[PDB]
Design goal:
This is part of a larger assembly, with chains A, B and C. Chain A is α/β, with parallel strands linked by helices. Chain A contains ten helices and 14 strands. The chains are: A alpha/beta, B alpha/beta, C alpha/beta. Chain A: This is Kinesin-like protein Klp10A.
Chain lengths: 309, 426, 412
């Protein structure tokens, strides 16, 4: 389990608003929140809180840089035959969609730019390497979203899927469509398709929205194996049913170290249970002073998750 | 406020006839007649179960869902049978096969849309909707399957209005069907995840309570049904009456469900004395709590004495002292501190209507949320496995377009449901 | 000089009709005399109609009687946002039309019932729109906050955690009278298990008369409205003192009536006589405004109070040397001709801020969570122009009201 935090820079709208930048990342693993506060007498003072993470990324850091530290180290895990998960967690507008899906203040744009794409790129390169080539693996991808306890196939026009659990308690999402990909270009097509289809409200003036949980997965399969050779699930979480899933998620990840159900944790459950499984959590933070309450909430959540480490 | 009853399956239907047989008299509504009400209070709140059209014809606002004509054609060809507007009868002349799968995926799934249609015509009736009453048996097709679907749809259409469910969980000793645990385990599954108040009744918990608590020697079904319908009247309709301290479905719900599962209760009536003799009138009140809180007298199969309670709701309905009521409840809570769970300082939810059951002086419906009902889903769940293991009469399900993972699902789910419930017994 | 009043919500209107009754009753102005100086708001016609059909029918102008034939709805949201909105303008208009006609006013005595639809919501924005249109005045809102165990509405807390957070940053001093804790007084200090709402109203209808009526009335130690908030609130939170009355003796049963000051003042601090289930379980007083009326010798007071200041078991806050605003009026109280109120020749309507409400708020906040924790009747507000915001963000609000009422006390 690795937990990181990434601060996004203040946007033009916030800047114009003259929002104050409350966060500083003086070191590679140190994040500081300069919380503004007022005493009862309304004296102004700053309570600077410090948080440490495996990796803390500044506003300057690009998606490639973030990807290098978080997801990239997980790819090998799938080739190893494990199950890896990477979660983007944070408040609305914190940058989760931007990081996973691609660069866009709308959270929707260039697929190539995001972690799903970058991860895919590495998957093809590694498969090609000598240690792996013997494996004769096929790469498959799927993209679905979870909304109000319901699973929808982004690859198959929001088709509602049913999720069942055996006595064995292994979960399966029936009807989920897996698409064969043999090129990064292929994966980019599927990402574009899924992202367009993603849930939301009316066309907002700007930005996307995270009413749902987005999960794009990369699966490796020889002919089954452990029900497939390896699987990487990249999840674009909804802004911090949602609460229950987040609570559920925390316990599952912490359970990962040692070894109040939700749909997300149910679908993901096989990814937590196995011995050979790794996860990375990236906490997104919006630097604005107005968002200070949200950020502390995000950071504290993050602390507990890493605690399991 | 309002509600719209739902008679799923034959049983749930047969009972409809008894629930409405009663309720009507508890509201002075003759077959097609109007309000003959001995009083004037049995009318200011009727709406909860009827609709205004003619001016003497207040028609029950329920639904009659069933894939076996003969049934509804027995309920519609007998006594009060001619009060339901025909529009209410959502029949399925198909083969009402005794398969959960045949009334939930293949046969019932068709008749559903023609039901929801009406469940909307009734919901959009008028004023404000509260919830829907659901009667059925978890041991058949039109009951567990098709009725368990009716709700899964209802709860998607109005995740706001409540959902009380009256289930006739498969009695132990003898099963009035063979696949029973199949049709059951599969319906409880749907219940633990849609309705938010379930009142489980046991045909044999009734017999007992009806053959020893009513020296009644020939307890016909009509009776059992009648007794049950007696409780569901105390619950709903009742609270839709005045009271020093009145509640309503929600209060009942918001005071009885500590954890979202939905949890199932076990109803118990108060004055349950044999006709002539017994008419002891020992009904001052300590006599009602004496009753309600004993083992026998719990329409459920399991015995409370076998597991703590989380919540209790003595919904009394007959002039009494908010003192001799509020008081009794206490001693009761202390004489049995043992089984009554502790992390709830006051498990009991005292409720108090005014007007009592038409001909009686004082009654009190009991709605218990005890952890004892663990020892029932256990039962059911057992029967499943013992037969699932060999896929017994499974071909009648799969062959109807089912899944080998569907049965797995339910059992587990409902099986876990047993687990949780213990998390409080401790 | 004056103080308008806006009775909002059926209750605030019932209590209004009551407080409004006691008035003329002690001013010799029968059914049809002068002209009131307030207004009546409700989104359920039938209730304001009671002021249009029943007693004190022609003592009002169909202009100071606002109604929204529409729907009340026991839900904040609807009353504040959605529906309640439509009326507000019109409402304001009167408190701007009635606020003009006068001569240098002092504020608006608002009458609402915390846990209602028209009472919680609406006002929320009424007081809201006032704090901006007349920030330069007094906003003393007289509330009837949620019975500690005997609430009515199923949602009550939703409606009261919401009227508190929205009004908090707008009121000057919020008086509080607990509906249940008043019953006790009707059971224990007057004896009657037959207390009609029409009684509790006669009571507040009394304690209130001691506030405005008589005070704005000449005396040996006058106390202006401003006076209150000044001598009564230590901090900007629209702080909520509690109302208490002394000679709450029965006009039939017992008769020791002649209970010199020395007695009636001690009868204020015993918790069983304070129109609020906030028994001084620990709450240190931090300021009390002892309003006396009738035949009272200033020494009697400046002694009866001295004796108290040294009872210690009555522990006053630390940072507060002396917190006793002695308000002396002349004219004794004036009891309903034949209700059930004794009728003494002197009384003590003492109100105060007590670290006690640390409780009352607590116990009412907790309520809220339980339900919110499951969203309970949330869909009823959302669908009425509200959001997960307003709730969660009004919860956090009061949270710092549980810390506030904690910090300003319990510590030295």
């Amino acid at each position: 389990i690795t937990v990181c935090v990434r601060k996004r820079p203040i946007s033009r709208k916030e800047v114009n608003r003259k929002e104050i930048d409350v966060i500083s990342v003086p070191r590679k693993d140190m994040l500081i929140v300069h919380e503004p506060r007022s005493k009862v007498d309304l004296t102004k003072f700053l309570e600077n809180h410090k948080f440490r993470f495996d990796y803390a990324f500044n506003d300057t850091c690009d998606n490639a840089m973030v990807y290098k530290y978080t997801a990239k180290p997980l790819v090998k895990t799938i080739f190893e035959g494990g199950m890896a998960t990477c979660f983007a967690y944070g408040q609305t507008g914190s940058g989760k969609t931007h990081t996973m899906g691609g660069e866009f203040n709308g959270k929707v744009q260039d697929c190539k730019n995001g972690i799903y794409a970058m991860a895919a790129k590495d998957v093809f390169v590694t498969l090609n390497m000598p240690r792996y080539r013997a494996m004769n693996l096929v790469v498959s991808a799927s993209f679905f979203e979870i909304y109000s306890g319901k699973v929808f196939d982004l690859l198959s026009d929001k088709q509602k899927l049913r999720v069942l659990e055996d006595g064995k308690q292994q979960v399966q999402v029936v009807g989920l469509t897996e698409k064969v990909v043999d090129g990064v270009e292929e994966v980019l097509k599927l990402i574009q398709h899924g992202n367009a289809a993603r849930t939301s409200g009316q066309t907002s003036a700007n930005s996307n929205s995270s009413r749902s949980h987005a999960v794009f997965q990369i699966v490796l399969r020889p002919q089954g194996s452990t029900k497939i050779h390896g699987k990487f699930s990249f999840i674009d979480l909804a802004g911090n049913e949602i609460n229950k899933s987040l609570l559920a998620l925390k316990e599952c990840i912490r359970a990962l170290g040692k070894q109040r159900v939700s749909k997300l944790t149910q679908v993901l459950r096989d990814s937590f249970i196995g011995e050979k499984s790794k996860t990375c959590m990236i906490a997104m933070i919006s630097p604005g002073l107005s968002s200070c309450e949200h950020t502390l909430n995000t950071l504290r959540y993050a602390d507990r998750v890493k605690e399991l480490v | 406020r309002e509600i719209v009853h739902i008679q799923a399956g034959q049983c749930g239907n047969q009972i409809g006839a008894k629930f409405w047989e009663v309720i009507s008299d508890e509201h002075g509504i003759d077959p097609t007649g109007s309000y003959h009400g001995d009083s004037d209070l049995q009318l200011e709140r009727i709406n909860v179960y009827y609709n205004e059209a003619a001016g003497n014809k207040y028609v029950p606002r329920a639904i009659l869902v069933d894939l076996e004509p003969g049934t509804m054609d027995s309920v519609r060809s007998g006594p009060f049978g001619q009060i339901f507007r025909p529009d209410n009868f959502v029949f399925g002349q198909s083969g009402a096969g005794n398969n959960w799968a045949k009334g939930h995926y293949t046969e019932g799934a068709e008749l559903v849309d023609s039901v929801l249609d009406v469940v909307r015509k009734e919901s959009e009736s008028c004023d404000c909707l509260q919830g829907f009453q659901l009667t059925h048996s978890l041991g058949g097709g039109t009951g567990s399957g098709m009725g368990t679907l009716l709700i899964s749809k209802i709860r998607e259409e109005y995740p706001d209005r409540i959902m009380n469910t009256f289930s006739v969980v498969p009695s132990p000793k003898v099963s009035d069907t063979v696949v029973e645990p199949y049709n059951a385990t599969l319906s409880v599954h749907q219940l633990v995840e849609n309705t938010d108040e379930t009142y489980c009744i046991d045909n044999e918990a009734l017999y007992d309570i009806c053959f020893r608590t009513l020296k009644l020697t020939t307890p016909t079904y009509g009776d059992l049904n009648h007794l049950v319908s007696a409780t569901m009247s105390g619950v709903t309709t009742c609270l839709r009456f005045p009271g020093q301290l009145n509640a309503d479905l929600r209060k009942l719900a918001v005071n009885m469900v500590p954890f979202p599962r939905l949890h199932f209760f076990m109803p118990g009536f108060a004055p349950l004395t044999s006709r002539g003799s017994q008419q002891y009138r020992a009904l001052t009140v300590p006599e009602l709590t004496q009753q309600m809180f004993d083992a026998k007298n719990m329409m459920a199969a399991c015995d409370p004495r076998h597991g703590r309670y989380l919540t209790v709701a003595a919904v009394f309905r007959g002039r009494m002292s908010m003192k001799e009521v509020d008081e009794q409840m206490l001693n009761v809570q202390n004489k049995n501190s043992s089984y009554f769970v502790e992390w709830i300082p006051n498990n009991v939810k005292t409720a108090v209507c005014d007007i009592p059951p038409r001909g009686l002086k004082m009654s009190a419906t009991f709605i218990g949320n005890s952890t004892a009902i663990q020892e029932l889903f256990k039962r059911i769940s057992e029967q499943f496995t013992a037969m699932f293991r060999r896929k017994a009469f499974l071909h009648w399900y799969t062959g109807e377009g089912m899944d080998e993972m569907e049965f797995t699902e339910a059992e587990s789910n409902m099986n876990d449901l047993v687990s949780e419930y213990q998390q409080y017994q401790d | 000089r004056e103080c308008i009043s806006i009775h909002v919500g059926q209750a605030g209107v019932q209590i209004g009709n009551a407080c409004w009754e006691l008035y003329c009753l002690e001013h010799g102005i029968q059914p049809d005399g002068h002209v009131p100086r307030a207004v009546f708001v409700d989104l359920e016609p039938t209730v304001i109609d009671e002021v249009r059909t029943g007693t004190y029918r022609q003592l009002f102008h169909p202009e100071q009687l606002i109604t929204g034939k529409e729907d009340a709805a026991n839900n904040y949201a609807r009353g504040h946002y959605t529906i309640g909105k439509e009326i507000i303008d019109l409402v304001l208009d009167r408190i701007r039309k009635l606020a003009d006609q006068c001569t240098g006013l002092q504020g608006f005595s608002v009458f609402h019932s915390f846990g209602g639809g028209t009472g919680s919501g609406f006002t929320s924005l009424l007081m809201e729109r006032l704090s901006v249109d007349y920030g330069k005045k007094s906003k003393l809102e007289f509330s009837i906050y949620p019975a500690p165990q005997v609430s009515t509405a199923v949602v009550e807390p939703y409606n009261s955690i919401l009227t508190t957070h929205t009004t908090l940053e707008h009121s000057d001093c919020a008086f509080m009278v607990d509906n249940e804790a008043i019953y006790d007084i009707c059971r224990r200090n007057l004896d009657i298990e037959r207390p009609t709402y029409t009684n509790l109203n006669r009571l507040i209808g009394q304690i209130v008369s001691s506030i405005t009526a008589s005070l704005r009335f000449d005396g040996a130690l006058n106390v202006d409205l401003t006076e209150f908030q000044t001598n009564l609130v230590p901090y900007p939170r629209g702080h909520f003192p509690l109302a208490t009355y002394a000679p709450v003796i029965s006009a039939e049963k017992a008769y020791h009536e002649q209970l010199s000051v020395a007695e009636i003042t001690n009868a204020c601090f015993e918790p069983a006589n304070q129109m609020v289930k906030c028994d001084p379980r620990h709450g240190k007083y931090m300021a009390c405004c002892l309003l006396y009326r009738g035949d009272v010798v200033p020494k009697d007071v400046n002694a009866a109070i001295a004796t108290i200041k040294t009872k210690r078991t009555i522990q006053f806050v630390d940072w507060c040397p002396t917190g006793f605003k002695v308000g002396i009026n002349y004219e004794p109280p004036t009891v309903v001709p034949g209700g059930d109120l004794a009728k003494v020749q002197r009384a003590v309507c003492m109100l105060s801020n007590t670290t006690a409400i640390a409780e009352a708020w607590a116990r009412l906040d907790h309520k809220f969570d339980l339900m919110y924790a499951k969203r309970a009747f949330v869909h009823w507000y959302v669908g009425e122009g509200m959001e997960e915001g307003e709730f969660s963000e009004a919860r956090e609000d009061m949270a710092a009201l549980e810390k506030d009422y904690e910090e300003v006390g319990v510590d030295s």
